[PDB]
Amino acid sequence: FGARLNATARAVITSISDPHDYDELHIPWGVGCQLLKYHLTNKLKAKFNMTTREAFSFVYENVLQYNQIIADLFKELIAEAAPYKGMGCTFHRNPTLQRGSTQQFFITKVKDDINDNSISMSVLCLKAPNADFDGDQLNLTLMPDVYLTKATERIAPHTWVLSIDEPHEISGNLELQGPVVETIINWAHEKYLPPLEEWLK
């Protein structure tokens, strides 16, 4: 029933508190330098005049060392996906009971800081699995093909929006977090205007 798949990774998770999309994943430098090795070898044999031994040495040398050429090749490999936002990948949770424990995201940005070893996930997708920042390691698989990425569309962050209990009700995984709600509470529910008696007098 399958075990120990290839083109995979396993790392701890952080959040993205930014203006972004609901399906965006940020792979760090050390994970992205080893998960995309033959892609970097193809880009270094195509754009530059290098053999596969020199390309393998350039890939394995700059894992714990930042340089501009590998970052530019990562930006090119992200930009090569024409109908998608990036490379399609799947993301799992180790207790997998519900629908939200297995999702499909897109790699959109490789980090520049070498000390940060964590995959940064969206805020709205934190609720569908029981995933917190309590030192837990989460798994990731890389879909190679376009047909496989189209077939993995059945598990998506938009698939668990509708509830499986009530007939016409959106489930509670769409609810915002604490500090996201509290600013709107302090903004909207404030003594901002005089009441309706004083306003028309």
Partner 1 sequence: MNLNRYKARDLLNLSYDDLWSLPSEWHLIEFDDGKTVVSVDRITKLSVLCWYPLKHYKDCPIPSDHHIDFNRILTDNPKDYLNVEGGRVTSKAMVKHLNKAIWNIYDWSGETVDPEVLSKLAIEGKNWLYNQTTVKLSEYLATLSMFDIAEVYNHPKVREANHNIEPTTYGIEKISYGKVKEVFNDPTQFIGNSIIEGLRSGTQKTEQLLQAFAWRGFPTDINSDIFKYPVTTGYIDGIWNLYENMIESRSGTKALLYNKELLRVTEYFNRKSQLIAQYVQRLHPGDCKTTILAEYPVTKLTLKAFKGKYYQKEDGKLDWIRGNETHLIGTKQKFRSVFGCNHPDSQGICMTCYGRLGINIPKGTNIGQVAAVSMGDKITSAVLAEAGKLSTEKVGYTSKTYLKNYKSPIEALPVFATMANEKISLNISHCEILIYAMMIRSAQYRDYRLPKPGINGQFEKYNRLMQCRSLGGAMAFEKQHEPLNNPGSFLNKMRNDHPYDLLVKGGKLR
Q: Where does this chain bind partner 1 (CB under 8 A)?
A: 1-2, 17, 19-22, 97-99, 123-124, 154, 157-159, 161-170, 172, 174-176, 178-193, 195-197, 199-200
Minimal distance, residue 61 CB to partner 1, in Å: 39
Cα-Cα-Cα-Cα torsion 59, 61, 67, 68, nearest 10 degrees, comes to -30
Comparison of 53 and 154: residue with beta carbon closer to partner 1: 154
Comparison of 83 and 179: residue with beta carbon closer to partner 1: 179
Can you tell me the distance from the alpha carbon of 41 to that of 53, in angstroms, rounded to the nearest whole number?
9
Minimal distance, residue 170 CB to partner 1, in Å: 4
Q: Among residues 135, 144, 112, which one has the least CA distance to residue 35? A: 144
Comparison of 113 and 169: residue with beta carbon closer to partner 1: 169
Angle formed at CA 58 by CA 50 and CA 63, multiple of 5 degrees: 155
3-state SS, residue 29: helix
Comparison of 4 and 191: residue with beta carbon closer to partner 1: 191
Let me know: does 22 contact 174? Beta carbons within 8 Å: no
Task: Please name every residue paired with 88 in a beta bridge, in sequence order, or none if there are none.
Answer: 106
Minimal distance, residue 113 CB to partner 1, in Å: 23
Minimal distance, residue 127 CB to partner 1, in Å: 11
